[PDB]
Amino acid sequence: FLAXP
Amino acid sequence: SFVEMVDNLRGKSGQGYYVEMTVGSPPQTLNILVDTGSSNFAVGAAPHPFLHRYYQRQLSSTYRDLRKGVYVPYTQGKWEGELGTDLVSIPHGPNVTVRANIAAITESDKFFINGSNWEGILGLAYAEIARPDDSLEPFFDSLVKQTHVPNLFSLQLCGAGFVGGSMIIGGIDHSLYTGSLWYTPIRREWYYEVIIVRVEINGQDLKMDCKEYNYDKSIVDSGTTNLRLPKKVFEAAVKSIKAASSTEKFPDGFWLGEQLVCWQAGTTPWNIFPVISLYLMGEVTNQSFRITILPQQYLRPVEATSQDDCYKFAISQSSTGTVMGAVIMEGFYVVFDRARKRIGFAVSACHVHDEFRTAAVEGPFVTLDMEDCGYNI
Secondary structure, eight states: OBOOO | OGGGTTTOEEOOSSSOOEEEEEETTTTEEEEEEEESSOOOEEEEOSOOTTOSOOOOGGGOTTOEEEEEEEEEEBSSOEEEEEEEEEEEEOTTSOSOEEEEEEEEEEEEESOSOTTOOOOEEEEOSOGGGOSSOTTSOOHHHHHHHHSSOOSOEEEEEEOOOOOEEEEEETSOOTTSEEEEEEEEEOSSBTTBEEOEEEEEETTEEOOOOHHHHTSSOEEEOTTOOSEEEEHHHHHHHHHHHHHHGGGSOOOTTTTTTSSOEEEETTOOOGGGSOOEEEEEEOSSTTOEEEEEEOHHHHEEEOOOOSSEEEEEEOEEEESSOEEEOHHHHTTEEEEEETTTTEEEEEEETTOOOOSSOOOEEEEEEOOOOGGGGOOOO
16 A cells, blocks of 8 residues: 555 | 454455445445555445445435545555545444545556455555645544544554454554553654664574665555565565575575465474564664564465465565565554554554464663664655
């Protein structure tokens, strides 16, 4: 699981 | 009291831990995955080969539609969907019911897992990383705002041997862990970011710059399977683990989790693999505690057949920071103390271990310049 920041 | 919530997580072993929830009016039951890595509530809302059911907005009287689309990318997999709201509830949680933002997952790629028995995802992180921005109160933030539950939950993920767990909403169940709780400050409320100040393999310092361990960030994340390390740190840990366990030689492809290791049932020589220790910045100035997993946390079991047990190496590399996923959490009771901006670990009363070793939380340890360990920009 989030990806990016 | 919290006994109603003990044992409320199930899991198809290696496919993620999920808590049952109901959505809408009348309430359609769905198994939701528990994910402290993401901050988005999202349920499969249209058919897919892998999921045996989904969310039919059409049949929910309490369902509104927000009229804005959403895209979420996970380190593994991604989906896009439509943003609604609706009434949410949890059977084996608090008897409360809120209106909370929901993403209806209408398109996905390598997200849902075949046999996983879940159909949706509960992002428990903070709003700063919600998609498409921080105007999307994450489910929990609403659950607390709309009810009396206190700002805190704790997770006890339970691994398998040769799957279950408990998500305690709003409190700490003292029956799930042994010994003391130890707390590391949450560095910033976005991911659940923590700061690691020292790494040891069978007690041997990895001897790298403190920054390198938190390179980018190090987060606690129930959604991720492996313990994930930044490249310099990974390649270093693989050498040291290879070193210690060298009592057996090994395919280069095993440490990449491409090949599995097999032994005649039970004869798995746990004792030859090193324990792993993370030291975390403690609550008290110039202080720190450590946590230690066993081979039984980083060698996830995998159901080839026969009279042989097979394991996959669950430590892998990462471009985006340390990720203390299930491999770590499966050994502790983790308490996400959002209220007091901190995270606690205690030895989980159900972590797989052997007669001669067990997982550990232990402290304190005099460590200086710990603030100097966090990375920046």
